[PDB]
Amino acid sequence: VSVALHPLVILNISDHWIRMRSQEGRPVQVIGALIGKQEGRNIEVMNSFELLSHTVEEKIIIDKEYYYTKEEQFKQVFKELEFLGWYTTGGPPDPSDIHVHKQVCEIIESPLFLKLNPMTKHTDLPVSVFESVIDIINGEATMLFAELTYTLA
Amino acid sequence: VSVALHPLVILNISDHWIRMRSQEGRPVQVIGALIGKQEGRNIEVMNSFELLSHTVEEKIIIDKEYYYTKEEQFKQVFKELEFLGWYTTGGPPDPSDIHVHKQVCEIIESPLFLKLNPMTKHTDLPVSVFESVIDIINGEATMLFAELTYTLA
Ligand SMILES: [Hg+2]
Ligand SMILES: [Hg+2]
Ligand SMILES: [Hg+2]
Ligand SMILES: [Hg+2]
Ligand SMILES: [Hg+2]
Ligand SMILES: [Hg+2]
Ligand SMILES: [Hg+2]
Ligand SMILES: [Hg+2]
Structure with missing residues (x-):
């Protein structure tokens, strides 16, 4: 096995x-299918779509009827x-994913699993701090921005 | 204007x-975008995706922020x-569609509008009624089905 995306x-x-x-x-978990072409050993995951399901005791049940009707x-x-x-x-693979995986494993023999972490912190956005400085090179004079290093509480 | 689909x-x-x-x-109204290529005047509606909105007094509000972030x-x-x-x-175009159309009209100049009626009655599925008849043609003999005309209460 070897995979493109x-x-x-x-x-x-x-x-x-x-x-x-x-x-x-509030953010909830989403679930869906991976489709595409599979030539040579080049498994090419070309696209995706949504899959219906239902959650009960933190266990997720794929709606098989919905999938086969769509197909x-x-x-x-x-x-x-x-x-x-x-x-x-x-995040990292959990017991619940294995539980869902076995059900996808009933649709095709050895299914791929793609997990995506949409969790982002605002505090991770780049932040640059500057102070103003008036430069006068022999001849030309101006105001510029000079970067400063900063700490975070 | 002239359109492909x-x-x-x-x-x-x-x-x-x-x-x-x-x-x-229960079935609810859905809303989304039409994308594709537009060569000559051959408007080729090649694909689509979903659009967020919110409904209040039977008036629908397109989430502009969601659209521009996706774009x-x-x-x-x-x-x-x-x-x-x-x-x-x-069904047929309604005042509510015009209301939503004016907002799409704010995204592109002369937007197309596609309406799809997902309403289907079960009673419209084909139903054939047959009677059995045992035929013995000179030589060969068999049982066949012979169609009957039927009324509907
Ligand atoms: Hg979904
Ligand atoms: Hg397929
Ligand atoms: Hg399996
Ligand atoms: Hg498997
Ligand atoms: Hg939607
Ligand atoms: Hg575009
Ligand atoms: Hg407009
Ligand atoms: Hg318009």
Whole structure:
């Protein structure tokens, strides 16, 4: 096995998470399929879409009917494509992902698993501090910005 | 103006409606963008995606921030593509669509509008009634099905 990954997949998944967080106000886990082409050993994950599910005791159940109906409904436009595996959002792999993985493992034999962590802290954005300094090179004179080093409480 | 339409758009929109009806149990209106290429005057609606909104007094408000952030986030993969117009589900055009259209009209100059009616009655599925008849043609004999005409209460 060896894997390629279009950036559209990663954007698709972020967008799914963002659309969902908005729906409730709080961020929730999202789940979906990985599709694409699989030539030679070049597994090319070309795209993705959303998968329905339902959560109960922190256990997630994939809606199989929804998947097969979509596959049915989309077989003509996804003819050159294949189901490669599934994705979800969050941190390092958890027991719950294995539980979901076994269900995807019932759809295709050895499914890929893509996990994306949409968690970002604002405090990680670049922050530069400057002080103003009036420079006069022999001849030309001006005000410039001179960078300062800073600590964080 | 003159327009082309990939079947992926129509499938995409059905799917959005279906994923949403599932979320609540009851079917709700869905809303999203139409993208693609626009060569000559051959407007080719190549694809679509979902748009956030919020509903109050039967009035729908497009989340502009969500749209521009997606466009920002997707500009690299949607570079050969353009925003062509918007879609929603339901019957013939209503005042509410005009209200939403004016907001899409603020994003691009002369936006297209695609409406899709996901309403289907079960009673419209084909139903054939047959009677059995045992035929013995000179030589060969068999049982076949012979169609009957039927009324509907
Ligand atoms: Hg979802
Ligand atoms: Hg497929
Ligand atoms: Hg399995
Ligand atoms: Hg497996
Ligand atoms: Hg939506
Ligand atoms: Hg675009
Ligand atoms: Hg306008
Ligand atoms: Hg307009």
